[PDB]
C-alpha cells in the first residue's frame, strides 16, 4: 500500500532484467522476449520472482 | 522570378547569393497577405484535386 515503494521495485526489477539482457547480448535488444527471463528455474530458466506488471 | 546578385569564385566551386534580402514593412505585409486572400479564395473556387510530386 505504499505507492512509491510499489513504483521503485517495478523499475528495479526491470533494471535487473536489463542487466541480464545487456549481459546476454551487447547491443541492448529491442524487446528481450519475456519468457527466458521470467520463467521458472527447474524447467531451465532464470526464475525471477517478478513483483511488477508486465504483459507477455 | 526577379533576380539576385551572385558572387562566384573563379574556381566556380561555390556561389553565394550576396543580396541580404531587404523588403519593406507594409509592402511585404500586404504582399504575403494578398497571397493569403487570393489563396483562400482560390481554394474556395477550384476543386483542385492536385499537389506537387514528392520528389
Amino acid at each position: 500500500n505504499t505507492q512509491e515503494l510499489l513504483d521503485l521495485l517495478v523499475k528495479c526489477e526491470n533494471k535487473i532484467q536489463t542487466r541480464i539482457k545487456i549481459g546476454l547480448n551487447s547491443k541492448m535488444p529491442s524487446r528481450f522476449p519475456p519468457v527466458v527471463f521470467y520463467t521458472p528455474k527447474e524447467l531451465g530458466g532464470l526464475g525471477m520472482l517478478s513483483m511488477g506488471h508486465v504483459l507477455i | 522570378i526577379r533576380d539576385v546578385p551572385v558572387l562566384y569564385h573563379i574556381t566556380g566551386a561555390i556561389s553565394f547569393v550576396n543580396e541580404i534580402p531587404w523588403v519593406i514593412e507594409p509592402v511585404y505585409i500586404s504582399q504575403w497577405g494578398s497571397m493569403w486572400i487570393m489563396m483562400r479564395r482560390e481554394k474556395r473556387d477550384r476543386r483542385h484535386f492536385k499537389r506537387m510530386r514528392f520528389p
Partner: protein, 111 residues
C-alpha cells in the same frame, strides 16, 4: 560535385550518391566495406542540409518549368516544411533539430 568529390576522394568505390541527395550502396556489400563507410556525422549532416536545399530548389525548378501556377510552389513549400519533419534530413545528425521540427509542425498546425 562537392560531396561526390569527397566520396570518390576517399578511395571507396562502393557507394553512389543520388543527385537528388540520397546515398545508396551498390554491390549489397558491407561488413568490411561498411566498416570504412558508415561514419562521418558531418557528411551525413551536410548531405541532409543540402538535401533540404535541393528539394526546395528543384521544387521551384519544376515550378518555373511545367506545373508552377499557384498550387505547386505554395503546397510544396508547405509540405516541404512538414517533410523537413517527415521526409528529409531527420534527427540522426544533431540533437536539437527535433525541437525546431516540432516547432515547425506546430506552426503548420496554427496556420
Amino acid at each position: 560535385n562537392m560531396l561526390n568529390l569527397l566520396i570518390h576522394r576517399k578511395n571507396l568505390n562502393y557507394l553512389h550518391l543520388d543527385y537528388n541527395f540520397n546515398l545508396k550502396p551498390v554491390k549489397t556489400l558491407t561488413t568490411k566495406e561498411r566498416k570504412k563507410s558508415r561514419f562521418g556525422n558531418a557528411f551525413h549532416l551536410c548531405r541532409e542540409v543540402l538535401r533540404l536545399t535541393k528539394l526546395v530548389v528543384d521544387s521551384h525548378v519544376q515550378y518555373r518549368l511545367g506545373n508552377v501556377d499557384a498550387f505547386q510552389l505554395a503546397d510544396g513549400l508547405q509540405y516541404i516544411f512538414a517533410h523537413v519533419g517527415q521526409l528529409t534530413g531527420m534527427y540522426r545528425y544533431k540533437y536539437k533539430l527535433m525541437r525546431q521540427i516540432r516547432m515547425c509542425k506546430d506552426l503548420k498546425h496554427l496556420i
